[PDB]
Amino acid sequence: DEVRQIAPGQTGKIADYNYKLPDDFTGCVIAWNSNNLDSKVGGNYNYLYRLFRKSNLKPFERDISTEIYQAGSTPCNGVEGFNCYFPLQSYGFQPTNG
Amino acid sequence: DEVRQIAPGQTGKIADYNYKLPDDFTGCVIAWNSNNLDSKVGGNYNYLYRLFRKSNLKPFERDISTEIYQAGSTPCNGVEGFNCYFPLQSYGFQPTNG
């Protein structure tokens, strides 16, 4: 459901937070299904993604910051408290998906 | 710095988002400093205030909504994602302030 957002000039939660496509994008995108190898029974959670991110991500840049994002202004000192959440999230891959 | 905005006929971020003063305001405002009791070292963040609101609010009305304010058209499903921010913010009180 996120291959739609990978295009020059589109918004979302992945195209703006993991890889920003500039307007002058002359590259090619190749995608295919290989669900028989990268997904197993029991819940495949080795792949992580960044759904929470502060502002944006510059084109052709990589962000690997694991700092807990702050929503309000109360600091959490890196715990699972209130008004903060850990930015990386796990996928929901399953070999019996649609 | 926000006692200035508490007056009938003034704008800002507190007098328009927390308590609106009508034109026919005949009440009295009493303010004083008690920083030796409501503040402590290490950061006193027990007091909250609102920064974002969808629109104007009626005078003498209290808003306690904790819903995440949406700035655009992409829903967030109540997370700290993109194009949305938490309206509630904590103060920066300190006993060693000016």
Curated annotation (Swiss-Prot), chains A, B:
**Disulfide bonds, which pairs?**
C76-C84
Q: What is the effect of changing A71V?
A: Increased resistance to neutralizing antibodies
User: What does the UniProt record report as the effect of altering K40T in this chain?
Assistant: In strain: Omicron/BQ.1.1
Task: Tell me the outcome of changing G42S.
Answer: In strain: Omicron/BA.1, Omicron/BA.2.75, Omicron/XBB.1.5, Omicron/EG.5.1
Per the record, what is the consequence of mutating N97T? In strain: 19B/501T
As for what it does, the entry says: Attaches the virion to the cell membrane by interacting with host receptor, initiating the infection. The major receptor is host ACE2. When S2/S2' has been cleaved, binding to the receptor triggers direct fusion at the cell membrane. When S2/S2' has not been cleaved, binding to the receptor results in internalization of the virus by endocytosis using host TFRC and GRM2 and leading to fusion of the virion membrane with the host endosomal membrane. Alternatively, may use NRP1/NRP2 and integrin as entry receptors.
Q: Which residues of the full protein are shown?
A: 405 to 502 of 1273
Q: What is the effect of changing L48R?
A: In strain: Delta/B.1.617.2, Epsilon/B.1.427/B.1.429, Kappa/B.1.617.1, Lambda/C.37, 19B/501Y, Omicron/BA.4, Omicron/BA.5, Omicron/BQ.1.1; Contributes to cellular immunity evasion and increases infectivity
Q: What is the effect of changing Y49F?
A: Decreased HLA binding to NF9 epitope. Increased binding affinity to human ACE2
Which intervals of the chain are annotated as region Immunodominant HLA epitope recognized by the CD8+? Answer: 44-52
Source organism per entry reads Severe acute respiratory syndrome coronavirus 2 (2019-nCoV)
Q: Please give the residue ranges the record annotates as the region Disordered.
A: 51-86
Q: Which gene encodes it?
A: S
Q: Which domain of life is it from?
A: Viruses
Outcome recorded upon mutating T74K: In strain: Delta/B.1.617.2, Omicron/BA.1, Omicron/BA.2, Omicron/BA.2.12.1, Omicron/BA.2.75, Omicron/BA.4, Omicron/BA.5, Omicron/BQ.1.1, Omicron/XBB.1.5, Omicron/EG.5.1
Give the quaternary structure: Binds to host ACE2. RBD also interacts with the N-linked glycan on 'Asn-90' of ACE2. Cleavage of S generates a polybasic C-terminal sequence on S1 that binds to host Neuropilin-1 (NRP1) and Neuropilin-2 (NRP2) receptors. Interacts with host integrin alpha-5/beta-1 (ITGA5:ITGB1) and with ACE2 in complex with integrin alpha-5/beta-1 (ITGA5:ITGB1). May interact via cytoplasmic c-terminus with M protein. May interact (via N-terminus) with host bilirubin and biliverdin, thereby preventing antibody binding to the SARS-CoV-2 spike NTD via an allosteric mechanism.
- The name this protein carries in UniProt is Spike protein S1
Q: What is the effect of changing V41P?
A: In strain: Omicron/XBB.1.5, Omicron/EG.5.1
Q: Relate the outcome reported for changing Q89Y.
A: Reduced host ACE2-binding affinity in vitro
Region described as Receptor-binding motif: spans on this chain: 33-98
- Impact of mutating Q89N? Reduced host ACE2-binding affinity in vitro
